[PDB]
């Protein structure tokens, strides 16, 4: 059963490795600035850095959500292949973000396209699913007569 | 296998879909008050609204565990209704702290107790599992004799 | 099938309970210090308290991630147990961070190596799934002549 998930498995562990390094690049500017615990304001460059990281943050569990649902319901691979393009544009969405504010939109929207695509996909799979087995029930109450 | 969680599958898209709402929300209040990336402050409508997402965002893998523990040790269709009052209140919530901030206390109460429930359902669930193999094994050791 | 991963999906619940926990200490801190919604700053020991919990909050979907793919593709017994004491060194580091941001450290250094440990293990179990499948057709093409 590790074989039908092995896959969606890899991509999370990536994912959990990219987010761990943004956290280490906030330690690492933290440093840089004199920003000491608690204190999330300082120098914008510092802001930047961890306003990236706590976005990343949030949106982990969105993409670790429909990456199992897409993956399962609908296709491995493509789920995982989705899983990628979006950990990689989240990878340059925070790099983009620690240099510019603006740098950062390219691969926001790369992002979030990636991440919307799985939900699609997620979404067909669901379907497909429930889908016959209620309009079999819908047409057998209306039978009947 | 999908048969067996197709509905945990399918209130985790609806979350996924509910917490998308609630950062497009965000970027709503974003350019509705002229506060731009990074700084999370601003008027108190904005501040409110930031704060929602925030707050919901932190509670939703909560939500995601104990759904799919008390979905899969407790009862699969349970498990699933409380996941749709717990992402029903937590609409209401963000609607409300959006409005006033008093204005959210009472879907959060809602929002609290159904993922308590969840939170017993999983609790009598991997009770039900592990208590008796134990019980047992506490009988055998005093046997013996 | 319940039975292979119930330790998994109980340290899971009792990283839940201890959020949760986490939770009421904040509110707890926002009564004693007169600090209402929204907000986040305020004296250093209630800004000490909420960003102990907030850290645990994004701690917590990388540690639920590598405690299943580690429990599932190397060892479910290992994976829970680094579980436990992650989730034991988080609690000693919300407590710690409460009374002092020095006394935080000492917890966050010991939960950190756990959540590497069980990177570690996701990393291994997984390398094991697809390593001799990949070295085999390394092979196979080359032989061949
Ligand atoms: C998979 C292993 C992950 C890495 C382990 C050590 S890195 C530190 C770890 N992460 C962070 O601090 C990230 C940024 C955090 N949001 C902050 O503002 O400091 C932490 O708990 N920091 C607490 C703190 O210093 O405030
Ligand atoms: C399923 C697809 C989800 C939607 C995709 C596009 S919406 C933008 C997305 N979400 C948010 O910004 C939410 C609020 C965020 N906390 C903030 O302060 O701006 C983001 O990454 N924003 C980054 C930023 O602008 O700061
Ligand atoms: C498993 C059940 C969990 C517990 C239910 C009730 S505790 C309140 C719950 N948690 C928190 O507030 C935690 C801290 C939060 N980050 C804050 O700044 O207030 C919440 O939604 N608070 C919203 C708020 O008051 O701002
Ligand atoms: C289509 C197949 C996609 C493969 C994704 C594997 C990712 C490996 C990450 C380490
Ligand atoms: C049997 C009831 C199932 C209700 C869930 C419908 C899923 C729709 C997913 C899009
Ligand atoms: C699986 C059984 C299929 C039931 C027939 C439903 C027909 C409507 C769907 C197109
Ligand atoms: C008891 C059954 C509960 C059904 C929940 C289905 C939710 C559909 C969300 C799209
Ligand atoms: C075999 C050891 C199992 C220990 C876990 C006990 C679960 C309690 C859940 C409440
Ligand atoms: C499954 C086997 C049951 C073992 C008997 C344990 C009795 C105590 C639980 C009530
Ligand atoms: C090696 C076995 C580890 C057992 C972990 C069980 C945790 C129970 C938490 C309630
Ligand atoms: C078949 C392609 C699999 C690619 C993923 C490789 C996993 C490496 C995990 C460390
Ligand atoms: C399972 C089949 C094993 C294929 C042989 C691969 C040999 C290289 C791995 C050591
Ligand atoms: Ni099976």
């Not at 914008?44 to 969105?62: D, I, K």
Request: net charge positive.
């Amino acid at each position: 059963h590790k074989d039908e998930v092995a896959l969606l498995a890899t991509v999370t562990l990536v994912g959990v490795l990219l987010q761990a390094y943004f956290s280490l690049q906030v330690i690492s500017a933290r440093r840089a600035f004199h920003v000491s615990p608690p204190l999330t304001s300082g120098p914008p460059e510092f802001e930047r850095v961890f306003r990236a990281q706590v976005n990343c943050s949030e949106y982990f569990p969105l993409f670790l959500a429909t990456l199992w649902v897409a993956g399962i319901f609908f296709h491995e691979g493509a789920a995982a292949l989705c899983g990628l393009f979006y950990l990689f544009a989240r990878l340059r969405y925070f790099q983009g973000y620690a240099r510019s504010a603006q740098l950062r939109l390219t691969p926001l929207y790369a992002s979030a396209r990636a991440l919307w695509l799985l939900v699609a996909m997620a979404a067909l799979g669901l379907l497909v699913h429930f889908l016959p087995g209620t309009l079999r029930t819908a047409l057998f109450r209306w039978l009947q007569m």
